[PDB]
Amino acid sequence: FGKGSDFNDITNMLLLKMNKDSKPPGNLKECSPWMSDFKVEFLRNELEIPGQYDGRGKPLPEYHVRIAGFDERVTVMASLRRPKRIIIRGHDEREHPFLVKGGEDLRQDQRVEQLFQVMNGILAQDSACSQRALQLRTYSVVPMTSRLGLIEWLENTVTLKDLLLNTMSQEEKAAYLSDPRAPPCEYKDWLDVGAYMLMYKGANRTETVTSFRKRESKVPADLLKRAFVRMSTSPEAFLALRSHFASSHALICISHWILGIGDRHLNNFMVAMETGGVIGIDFGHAFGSATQFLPVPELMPFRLTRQFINLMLPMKETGLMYSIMVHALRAFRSDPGLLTNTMDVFVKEPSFDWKNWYPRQKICYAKRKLAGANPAVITCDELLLGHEKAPAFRDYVAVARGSKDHNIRAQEPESGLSEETQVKCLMDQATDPNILGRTWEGWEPWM
Amino acid sequence: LQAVAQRDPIIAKQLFSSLFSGILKEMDKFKTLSEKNNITQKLLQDFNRFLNTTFSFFPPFVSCIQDISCQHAALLSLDPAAVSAGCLASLQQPVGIRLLEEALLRLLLPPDVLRWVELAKLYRSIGEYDVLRGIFTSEIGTKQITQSALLAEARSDYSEAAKQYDEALNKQDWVDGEPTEAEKDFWELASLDCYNHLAEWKSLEYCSTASIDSEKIWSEPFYQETYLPYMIRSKLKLLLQGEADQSLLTFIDKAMHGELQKAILELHYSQELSLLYLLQDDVDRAKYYIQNGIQSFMQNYSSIDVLLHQSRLTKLQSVQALTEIQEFISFISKQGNLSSQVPL
Amino acid sequence: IRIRVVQMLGSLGGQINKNLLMMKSYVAWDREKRLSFAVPFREMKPVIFLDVFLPRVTELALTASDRQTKVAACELLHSMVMFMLGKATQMPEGGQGAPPMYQLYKRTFPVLLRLACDVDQVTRQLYEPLVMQLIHWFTNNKKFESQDTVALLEAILDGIVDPVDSTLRDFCGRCIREFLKWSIKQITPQQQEKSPVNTKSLFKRLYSLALHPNAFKRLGASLAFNNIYREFREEE
Amino acid sequence: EVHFLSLATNFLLEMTSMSPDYPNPMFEHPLSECEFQEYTIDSDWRFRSTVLT
């Protein structure tokens, strides 16, 4: 190119085979001269620690810790963007891990964080919720540019995946998971990539259920409870821990389903090691995009796995979970007229989904949902939107409607309904039968 | 360690539980399975006898007993009812809940409805209703009136729930199979609870129940052992609002004969004794009773663990009650206060 | 006294009294179970995890009426910390700076300083020499790598930034002075120049705190420098 | 007396079994973090100076 097709990709793949090991000079890099530049003096202006101002109605002070000094270390977990884990240091000599994303517009994720804060304020304003004192835990994300953004690190947590793995014989887990992965579910319901369309095309209820049975027998149980007891110190402490954690988990599930957040893998959820508080991550997928913008199945409303049921014996997801859902949705029966003013900041970053139709259609779906809707109806219409031409699409909307009587009967609680009807439909018709029949391997139903 | 054990009961119970668990974990190394089963059986007899024999329910003691029991599956065969009653009275709801849940799980419709309803009453005590739905929605709410009254109370109303209980206990032609005694007892407890909630005197004399089924003398059955505080609170409320029967007073006097009934009366109702003797204006014994109740309460709270916050909150209303009555007695007349104007 | 206390509590009413009480009161300090001890017997050696008593005893040892009870508690805590410190050695420790006991340091150390800087001089005289010995231990060359960091950081933040307990602040300052002096004595210049635990790190911390907007940080840094001055004037 | 010492030692030591620590390790801690799987030993009338095939 002395001046401006497939030849572009042919050129790109040349460097694509030797690339992508970003090691700056030492852990204390010099890609930032600041790493050793402008220690606190009048040589420059003091740099505030990112995102440390939180508008709470009061003009914030300014004595807050600002970026000064560094003990920098670089670790790049090989994720989709291969994010960079960095240590920012303020003048208080306080460590700060920040997760440096690559090229992305976190403006949408910034809206997500704002909405999280708004709904937390709503929970505070709700009578029964504040009585039970439910609250979401968030964190700071800052989009640097359109092609650059930065987020915070939680500083004490672990993925639920590893947290389950380490609380049991990890050799057994690896052996008896790695052995059946594609056969048990992704092959032994039709028999590879693309063959999932035939899978769900050829899926039938009996092989559906039997496949799920093989999946559940594949994996051990109570690993969540093992983690609880390992983390607990007294029985009552364990009870309070499990109750609080389950309530927080339910709140996350309902919130991100309302937002239609795409959380397939287990690693969408990080759990703190102090309060056992699970927190969701990896945003950008919203409004059922994975259903529409992706061919992979995203019919499930949230992550509700076998261990989430084995969380303890007497629980049936119709106790505390049911009530949490009830209180949340009751607190959400007046928020639309409010919250519709929110996810339409201007039009809320138009065509963001197209670069990651109209977002107005998505917000119409959302407000229709919050005003009362059948989740099966939402799934069917979202599948029709920009995904109807796909093969086995009639099968997809059928399993969204559900096959069995205990799945078809969700048609009655439809298009405006009680909170409890909507949540019971979510937990019943949207959670089990789809994962039984049409599920994504990365969603990892077995675990 | 031996020094502090007699000092702090909490440290004592932690140490005792730990050493007990270690000893049990060790005995297997040199014992046959039958020997372990025999020893376990003996321990279960001992513990059930303990639960059935204690009247004072020492929070640390009963908590340690329940914890040690839940340490080992072999202990899960214990009597649920007495444990539930004690942990209820001794504010040990969470530890009892955990114990009963672990016993149910290890034991895997089955008569677990016994332990089911015991857990249900435990959650009702802590005001927890949400699990109860899930408890009875599967197979346990054999009488759906139970679930209906549960959700009716969940919305902070009791009158409709009170009717539910009254008709359920008066529902006898159970085409669905007659309930166990446990469910009816639960209905009785719920009726008493809502009558207290309907603190209006009409529901208070409902709470009197007129001693249904024709029943110290009127407290000996363990059901009546549980009902007695409700009975006396109702009668005392009636007397304070203006009733004069003295029958409750005579019952108290008879309870003075024999210490155990008396002993537990000062153990849990010394305030009520003070108020009663204030009704007859016998200020001296009322003052002594309130002093004793204050000491009992304060040592109780000192015996309460920290993380059981809600337990402490439930303890804390007694502070205001005893303080109000203490202010009253300490301001009865100490200079001829009635002749003075001290609206302080 | 207790009678008048409960009298006050009832006088204030519930809406006030509930101010007595989210980390939600507990974290179960160690993710693991350790601090084991096999109680001796002629027939068996039952093992006991001493750690379970730490959160309780500390609260008893730190806060208690009944001078007899509090003294028993503090003596027993001294014994357990002695035992745990001894158990620190002979440990496979290739996963953390102090895997078999790291969090216990975090829990204990503030309590240790409070117990070594408090009233009832019996506790003072049984703890202050003990904490000096602890300094001389966790200033060793072997004891100079990521576990001394915990005690150092605590002995910084404890009083040097603290609203209350002036004698605590002064005591922790003198502890810092003694600690740095002992580090100078025992340790080769090689480690001090290599290990970040040295006078320059302390200088940076002090400059930060004095710059940091708060009376407590700046006052602690000032007084700590005043303490260290007596020996630091003797360094060229 | 040819074996007297051996017999005295046996009478003094094979009795020492009731000590609870007697079947227990002198050190309940690994030398460091590692994995110590079972290792056996094979005994036979087969020795060196035997094999060249």
PDB file of N, CA, C and O in Angstrom, chain A residues 172-226:
ATOM      1  N   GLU A 172     -10.169 -35.667  38.957  1.00  0.00           N
ATOM      2  CA  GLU A 172     -11.429 -36.282  38.565  1.00  0.00           C
ATOM      3  C   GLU A 172     -12.217 -35.368  37.642  1.00  0.00           C
ATOM      4  O   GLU A 172     -12.779 -35.818  36.636  1.00  0.00           O
ATOM      5  N   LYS A 173     -12.270 -34.078  37.975  1.00  0.00           N
ATOM      6  CA  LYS A 173     -12.991 -33.121  37.146  1.00  0.00           C
ATOM      7  C   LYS A 173     -12.435 -33.105  35.732  1.00  0.00           C
ATOM      8  O   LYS A 173     -13.179 -33.250  34.757  1.00  0.00           O
ATOM      9  N   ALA A 174     -11.117 -32.951  35.603  1.00  0.00           N
ATOM     10  CA  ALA A 174     -10.508 -32.911  34.282  1.00  0.00           C
ATOM     11  C   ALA A 174     -10.734 -34.213  33.530  1.00  0.00           C
ATOM     12  O   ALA A 174     -11.095 -34.199  32.349  1.00  0.00           O
ATOM     13  N   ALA A 175     -10.556 -35.351  34.204  1.00  0.00           N
ATOM     14  CA  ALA A 175     -10.662 -36.634  33.521  1.00  0.00           C
ATOM     15  C   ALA A 175     -12.077 -36.880  33.017  1.00  0.00           C
ATOM     16  O   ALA A 175     -12.277 -37.239  31.851  1.00  0.00           O
ATOM     17  N   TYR A 176     -13.074 -36.681  33.873  1.00  0.00           N
ATOM     18  CA  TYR A 176     -14.439 -37.051  33.534  1.00  0.00           C
ATOM     19  C   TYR A 176     -15.244 -35.905  32.941  1.00  0.00           C
ATOM     20  O   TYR A 176     -16.423 -36.094  32.625  1.00  0.00           O
ATOM     21  N   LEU A 177     -14.645 -34.728  32.783  1.00  0.00           N
ATOM     22  CA  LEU A 177     -15.208 -33.691  31.935  1.00  0.00           C
ATOM     23  C   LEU A 177     -14.570 -33.741  30.554  1.00  0.00           C
ATOM     24  O   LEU A 177     -15.264 -33.912  29.550  1.00  0.00           O
ATOM     25  N   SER A 178     -13.237 -33.654  30.504  1.00  0.00           N
ATOM     26  CA  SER A 178     -12.520 -33.665  29.236  1.00  0.00           C
ATOM     27  C   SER A 178     -12.848 -34.895  28.405  1.00  0.00           C
ATOM     28  O   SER A 178     -12.847 -34.822  27.170  1.00  0.00           O
ATOM     29  N   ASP A 179     -13.128 -36.028  29.046  1.00  0.00           N
ATOM     30  CA  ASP A 179     -13.433 -37.208  28.251  1.00  0.00           C
ATOM     31  C   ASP A 179     -14.757 -36.982  27.518  1.00  0.00           C
ATOM     32  O   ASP A 179     -14.738 -36.853  26.289  1.00  0.00           O
ATOM     33  N   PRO A 180     -15.927 -36.920  28.191  1.00  0.00           N
ATOM     34  CA  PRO A 180     -17.126 -36.515  27.454  1.00  0.00           C
ATOM     35  C   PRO A 180     -17.336 -35.007  27.460  1.00  0.00           C
ATOM     36  O   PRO A 180     -17.777 -34.459  28.475  1.00  0.00           O
ATOM     37  N   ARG A 181     -17.050 -34.315  26.356  1.00  0.00           N
ATOM     38  CA  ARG A 181     -17.502 -32.936  26.201  1.00  0.00           C
ATOM     39  C   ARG A 181     -18.339 -32.741  24.945  1.00  0.00           C
ATOM     40  O   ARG A 181     -19.501 -32.339  25.041  1.00  0.00           O
ATOM     41  N   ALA A 182     -17.792 -33.037  23.776  1.00  0.00           N
ATOM     42  CA  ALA A 182     -18.524 -32.901  22.526  1.00  0.00           C
ATOM     43  C   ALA A 182     -19.433 -34.104  22.285  1.00  0.00           C
ATOM     44  O   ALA A 182     -20.581 -33.914  21.872  1.00  0.00           O
ATOM     45  N   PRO A 183     -18.981 -35.338  22.505  1.00  0.00           N
ATOM     46  CA  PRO A 183     -19.887 -36.478  22.360  1.00  0.00           C
ATOM     47  C   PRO A 183     -21.134 -36.327  23.214  1.00  0.00           C
ATOM     48  O   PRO A 183     -22.243 -36.290  22.662  1.00  0.00           O
ATOM     49  N   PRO A 184     -21.010 -36.203  24.547  1.00  0.00           N
ATOM     50  CA  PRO A 184     -22.202 -36.402  25.391  1.00  0.00           C
ATOM     51  C   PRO A 184     -23.341 -35.456  25.072  1.00  0.00           C
ATOM     52  O   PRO A 184     -24.510 -35.857  25.124  1.00  0.00           O
ATOM     53  N   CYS A 185     -23.033 -34.210  24.736  1.00  0.00           N
ATOM     54  CA  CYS A 185     -24.059 -33.221  24.449  1.00  0.00           C
ATOM     55  C   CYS A 185     -24.004 -32.728  23.015  1.00  0.00           C
ATOM     56  O   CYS A 185     -25.032 -32.724  22.334  1.00  0.00           O
ATOM     57  N   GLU A 186     -22.833 -32.301  22.542  1.00  0.00           N
ATOM     58  CA  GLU A 186     -22.696 -31.730  21.209  1.00  0.00           C
ATOM     59  C   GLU A 186     -22.596 -32.772  20.102  1.00  0.00           C
ATOM     60  O   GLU A 186     -22.646 -32.399  18.926  1.00  0.00           O
ATOM     61  N   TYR A 187     -22.456 -34.054  20.428  1.00  0.00           N
ATOM     62  CA  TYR A 187     -22.550 -35.086  19.401  1.00  0.00           C
ATOM     63  C   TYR A 187     -23.660 -36.086  19.659  1.00  0.00           C
ATOM     64  O   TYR A 187     -24.396 -36.433  18.728  1.00  0.00           O
ATOM     65  N   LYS A 188     -23.811 -36.563  20.890  1.00  0.00           N
ATOM     66  CA  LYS A 188     -24.806 -37.597  21.137  1.00  0.00           C
ATOM     67  C   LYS A 188     -26.182 -36.986  21.353  1.00  0.00           C
ATOM     68  O   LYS A 188     -26.873 -37.304  22.325  1.00  0.00           O
ATOM     69  N   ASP A 189     -26.573 -36.090  20.450  1.00  0.00           N
ATOM     70  CA  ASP A 189     -27.968 -35.725  20.268  1.00  0.00           C
ATOM     71  C   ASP A 189     -28.326 -35.593  18.792  1.00  0.00           C
ATOM     72  O   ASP A 189     -29.515 -35.512  18.466  1.00  0.00           O
ATOM     73  N   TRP A 190     -27.337 -35.556  17.893  1.00  0.00           N
ATOM     74  CA  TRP A 190     -27.510 -35.779  16.464  1.00  0.00           C
ATOM     75  C   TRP A 190     -26.691 -36.941  15.944  1.00  0.00           C
ATOM     76  O   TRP A 190     -27.110 -37.597  14.990  1.00  0.00           O
ATOM     77  N   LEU A 191     -25.539 -37.210  16.545  1.00  0.00           N
ATOM     78  CA  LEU A 191     -24.623 -38.214  16.040  1.00  0.00           C
ATOM     79  C   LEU A 191     -24.533 -39.386  17.009  1.00  0.00           C
ATOM     80  O   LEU A 191     -24.580 -39.210  18.226  1.00  0.00           O
ATOM     81  N   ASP A 192     -20.211 -31.558  14.781  1.00  0.00           N
ATOM     82  CA  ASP A 192     -19.161 -30.548  14.838  1.00  0.00           C
ATOM     83  C   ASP A 192     -19.722 -29.146  14.628  1.00  0.00           C
ATOM     84  O   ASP A 192     -20.912 -28.905  14.838  1.00  0.00           O
ATOM     85  N   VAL A 193     -18.853 -28.222  14.217  1.00  0.00           N
ATOM     86  CA  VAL A 193     -19.277 -26.849  13.981  1.00  0.00           C
ATOM     87  C   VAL A 193     -20.257 -26.813  12.816  1.00  0.00           C
ATOM     88  O   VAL A 193     -20.078 -27.502  11.802  1.00  0.00           O
ATOM     89  N   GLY A 194     -21.320 -26.029  12.968  1.00  0.00           N
ATOM     90  CA  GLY A 194     -22.365 -25.990  11.968  1.00  0.00           C
ATOM     91  C   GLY A 194     -23.363 -27.112  12.158  1.00  0.00           C
ATOM     92  O   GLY A 194     -24.565 -26.927  11.947  1.00  0.00           O
ATOM     93  N   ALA A 195     -22.877 -28.281  12.577  1.00  0.00           N
ATOM     94  CA  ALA A 195     -23.766 -29.393  12.882  1.00  0.00           C
ATOM     95  C   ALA A 195     -24.653 -29.114  14.079  1.00  0.00           C
ATOM     96  O   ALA A 195     -25.499 -29.950  14.400  1.00  0.00           O
ATOM     97  N   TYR A 196     -24.471 -27.976  14.751  1.00  0.00           N
ATOM     98  CA  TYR A 196     -25.413 -27.566  15.786  1.00  0.00           C
ATOM     99  C   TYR A 196     -26.760 -27.187  15.192  1.00  0.00           C
ATOM    100  O   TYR A 196     -27.800 -27.392  15.827  1.00  0.00           O
ATOM    101  N   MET A 197     -26.766 -26.623  13.984  1.00  0.00           N
ATOM    102  CA  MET A 197     -28.035 -26.321  13.335  1.00  0.00           C
ATOM    103  C   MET A 197     -28.814 -27.598  13.047  1.00  0.00           C
ATOM    104  O   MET A 197     -30.032 -27.647  13.245  1.00  0.00           O
ATOM    105  N   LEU A 198     -28.125 -28.644  12.587  1.00  0.00           N
ATOM    106  CA  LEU A 198     -28.758 -29.952  12.452  1.00  0.00           C
ATOM    107  C   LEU A 198     -29.148 -30.516  13.813  1.00  0.00           C
ATOM    108  O   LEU A 198     -30.206 -31.142  13.956  1.00  0.00           O
ATOM    109  N   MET A 199     -28.281 -30.333  14.810  1.00  0.00           N
ATOM    110  CA  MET A 199     -28.550 -30.729  16.187  1.00  0.00           C
ATOM    111  C   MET A 199     -29.925 -30.275  16.638  1.00  0.00           C
ATOM    112  O   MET A 199     -30.817 -31.084  16.911  1.00  0.00           O
ATOM    113  N   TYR A 200     -30.106 -28.962  16.704  1.00  0.00           N
ATOM    114  CA  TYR A 200     -31.379 -28.410  17.140  1.00  0.00           C
ATOM    115  C   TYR A 200     -32.468 -28.679  16.115  1.00  0.00           C
ATOM    116  O   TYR A 200     -33.644 -28.800  16.473  1.00  0.00           O
ATOM    117  N   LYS A 201     -32.092 -28.792  14.843  1.00  0.00           N
ATOM    118  CA  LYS A 201     -33.030 -29.228  13.820  1.00  0.00           C
ATOM    119  C   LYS A 201     -33.505 -30.648  14.093  1.00  0.00           C
ATOM    120  O   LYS A 201     -34.704 -30.941  14.024  1.00  0.00           O
ATOM    121  N   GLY A 202     -32.576 -31.540  14.419  1.00  0.00           N
ATOM    122  CA  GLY A 202     -32.884 -32.925  14.697  1.00  0.00           C
ATOM    123  C   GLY A 202     -33.166 -33.246  16.146  1.00  0.00           C
ATOM    124  O   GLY A 202     -33.331 -34.422  16.485  1.00  0.00           O
ATOM    125  N   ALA A 203     -33.227 -32.240  17.013  1.00  0.00           N
ATOM    126  CA  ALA A 203     -33.456 -32.487  18.429  1.00  0.00           C
ATOM    127  C   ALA A 203     -34.890 -32.934  18.679  1.00  0.00           C
ATOM    128  O   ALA A 203     -35.835 -32.419  18.076  1.00  0.00           O
ATOM    129  N   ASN A 204     -35.047 -33.903  19.577  1.00  0.00           N
ATOM    130  CA  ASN A 204     -36.358 -34.367  20.002  1.00  0.00           C
ATOM    131  C   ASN A 204     -36.353 -34.518  21.515  1.00  0.00           C
ATOM    132  O   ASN A 204     -35.304 -34.694  22.136  1.00  0.00           O
ATOM    133  N   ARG A 205     -37.553 -34.472  22.098  1.00  0.00           N
ATOM    134  CA  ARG A 205     -37.681 -34.294  23.541  1.00  0.00           C
ATOM    135  C   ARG A 205     -37.050 -35.443  24.322  1.00  0.00           C
ATOM    136  O   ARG A 205     -36.426 -35.218  25.364  1.00  0.00           O
ATOM    137  N   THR A 206     -37.221 -36.681  23.859  1.00  0.00           N
ATOM    138  CA  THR A 206     -36.698 -37.812  24.621  1.00  0.00           C
ATOM    139  C   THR A 206     -35.173 -37.843  24.601  1.00  0.00           C
ATOM    140  O   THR A 206     -34.532 -37.994  25.648  1.00  0.00           O
ATOM    141  N   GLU A 207     -34.572 -37.695  23.418  1.00  0.00           N
ATOM    142  CA  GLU A 207     -33.119 -37.614  23.348  1.00  0.00           C
ATOM    143  C   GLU A 207     -32.615 -36.356  24.035  1.00  0.00           C
ATOM    144  O   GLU A 207     -31.533 -36.365  24.624  1.00  0.00           O
ATOM    145  N   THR A 208     -33.397 -35.281  23.982  1.00  0.00           N
ATOM    146  CA  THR A 208     -33.141 -34.087  24.777  1.00  0.00           C
ATOM    147  C   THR A 208     -32.944 -34.423  26.253  1.00  0.00           C
ATOM    148  O   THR A 208     -31.892 -34.137  26.847  1.00  0.00           O
ATOM    149  N   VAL A 209     -33.957 -35.044  26.857  1.00  0.00           N
ATOM    150  CA  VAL A 209     -33.916 -35.327  28.286  1.00  0.00           C
ATOM    151  C   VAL A 209     -32.800 -36.308  28.603  1.00  0.00           C
ATOM    152  O   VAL A 209     -32.087 -36.155  29.598  1.00  0.00           O
ATOM    153  N   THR A 210     -32.633 -37.334  27.767  1.00  0.00           N
ATOM    154  CA  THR A 210     -31.597 -38.326  28.026  1.00  0.00           C
ATOM    155  C   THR A 210     -30.210 -37.706  27.933  1.00  0.00           C
ATOM    156  O   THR A 210     -29.316 -38.036  28.724  1.00  0.00           O
ATOM    157  N   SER A 211     -30.010 -36.807  26.968  1.00  0.00           N
ATOM    158  CA  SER A 211     -28.746 -36.096  26.860  1.00  0.00           C
ATOM    159  C   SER A 211     -28.487 -35.268  28.104  1.00  0.00           C
ATOM    160  O   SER A 211     -27.364 -35.249  28.624  1.00  0.00           O
ATOM    161  N   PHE A 212     -29.515 -34.586  28.608  1.00  0.00           N
ATOM    162  CA  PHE A 212     -29.317 -33.811  29.827  1.00  0.00           C
ATOM    163  C   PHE A 212     -28.998 -34.723  31.005  1.00  0.00           C
ATOM    164  O   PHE A 212     -28.206 -34.363  31.881  1.00  0.00           O
ATOM    165  N   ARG A 213     -29.622 -35.902  31.048  1.00  0.00           N
ATOM    166  CA  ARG A 213     -29.339 -36.854  32.116  1.00  0.00           C
ATOM    167  C   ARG A 213     -27.893 -37.313  32.068  1.00  0.00           C
ATOM    168  O   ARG A 213     -27.226 -37.417  33.105  1.00  0.00           O
ATOM    169  N   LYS A 214     -27.394 -37.601  30.870  1.00  0.00           N
ATOM    170  CA  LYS A 214     -25.992 -37.971  30.735  1.00  0.00           C
ATOM    171  C   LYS A 214     -25.087 -36.817  31.143  1.00  0.00           C
ATOM    172  O   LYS A 214     -24.035 -37.028  31.758  1.00  0.00           O
ATOM    173  N   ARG A 215     -25.484 -35.588  30.809  1.00  0.00           N
ATOM    174  CA  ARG A 215     -24.699 -34.423  31.205  1.00  0.00           C
ATOM    175  C   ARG A 215     -24.634 -34.286  32.721  1.00  0.00           C
ATOM    176  O   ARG A 215     -23.565 -34.033  33.286  1.00  0.00           O
ATOM    177  N   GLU A 216     -25.771 -34.453  33.399  1.00  0.00           N
ATOM    178  CA  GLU A 216     -25.803 -34.243  34.842  1.00  0.00           C
ATOM    179  C   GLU A 216     -25.115 -35.381  35.583  1.00  0.00           C
ATOM    180  O   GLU A 216     -24.469 -35.158  36.612  1.00  0.00           O
ATOM    181  N   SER A 217     -25.243 -36.609  35.081  1.00  0.00           N
ATOM    182  CA  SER A 217     -24.493 -37.714  35.659  1.00  0.00           C
ATOM    183  C   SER A 217     -23.002 -37.580  35.400  1.00  0.00           C
ATOM    184  O   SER A 217     -22.200 -38.125  36.165  1.00  0.00           O
ATOM    185  N   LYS A 218     -22.621 -36.865  34.340  1.00  0.00           N
ATOM    186  CA  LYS A 218     -21.209 -36.671  34.034  1.00  0.00           C
ATOM    187  C   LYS A 218     -20.499 -35.908  35.143  1.00  0.00           C
ATOM    188  O   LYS A 218     -19.366 -36.239  35.511  1.00  0.00           O
ATOM    189  N   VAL A 219     -21.153 -34.893  35.697  1.00  0.00           N
ATOM    190  CA  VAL A 219     -20.507 -33.945  36.599  1.00  0.00           C
ATOM    191  C   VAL A 219     -20.880 -34.261  38.043  1.00  0.00           C
ATOM    192  O   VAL A 219     -22.015 -34.684  38.312  1.00  0.00           O
ATOM    193  N   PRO A 220     -19.963 -34.105  38.994  1.00  0.00           N
ATOM    194  CA  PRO A 220     -20.339 -34.189  40.409  1.00  0.00           C
ATOM    195  C   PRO A 220     -21.184 -32.992  40.820  1.00  0.00           C
ATOM    196  O   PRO A 220     -21.329 -32.010  40.090  1.00  0.00           O
ATOM    197  N   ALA A 221     -21.743 -33.085  42.019  1.00  0.00           N
ATOM    198  CA  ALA A 221     -22.640 -32.071  42.556  1.00  0.00           C
ATOM    199  C   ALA A 221     -22.047 -31.462  43.822  1.00  0.00           C
ATOM    200  O   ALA A 221     -20.922 -31.768  44.217  1.00  0.00           O
ATOM    201  N   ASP A 222     -22.820 -30.559  44.427  1.00  0.00           N
ATOM    202  CA  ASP A 222     -22.571 -29.904  45.711  1.00  0.00           C
ATOM    203  C   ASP A 222     -21.224 -29.196  45.784  1.00  0.00           C
ATOM    204  O   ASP A 222     -20.813 -28.771  46.871  1.00  0.00           O
ATOM    205  N   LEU A 223     -20.535 -29.039  44.653  1.00  0.00           N
ATOM    206  CA  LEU A 223     -19.258 -28.336  44.664  1.00  0.00           C
ATOM    207  C   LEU A 223     -19.431 -26.903  45.132  1.00  0.00           C
ATOM    208  O   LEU A 223     -18.546 -26.351  45.796  1.00  0.00           O
ATOM    209  N   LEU A 224     -20.571 -26.291  44.810  1.00  0.00           N
ATOM    210  CA  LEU A 224     -20.916 -25.005  45.401  1.00  0.00           C
ATOM    211  C   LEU A 224     -21.006 -25.112  46.915  1.00  0.00           C
ATOM    212  O   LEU A 224     -20.480 -24.262  47.643  1.00  0.00           O
ATOM    213  N   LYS A 225     -21.659 -26.163  47.408  1.00  0.00           N
ATOM    214  CA  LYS A 225     -21.749 -26.355  48.848  1.00  0.00           C
ATOM    215  C   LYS A 225     -20.394 -26.700  49.448  1.00  0.00           C
ATOM    216  O   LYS A 225     -20.105 -26.312  50.585  1.00  0.00           O
ATOM    217  N   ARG A 226     -19.555 -27.428  48.706  1.00  0.00           N
ATOM    218  CA  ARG A 226     -18.194 -27.665  49.169  1.00  0.00           C
ATOM    219  C   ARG A 226     -17.449 -26.355  49.337  1.00  0.00           C
ATOM    220  O   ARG A 226     -16.753 -26.148  50.334  1.00  0.00           O
TER     221      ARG A 226
END
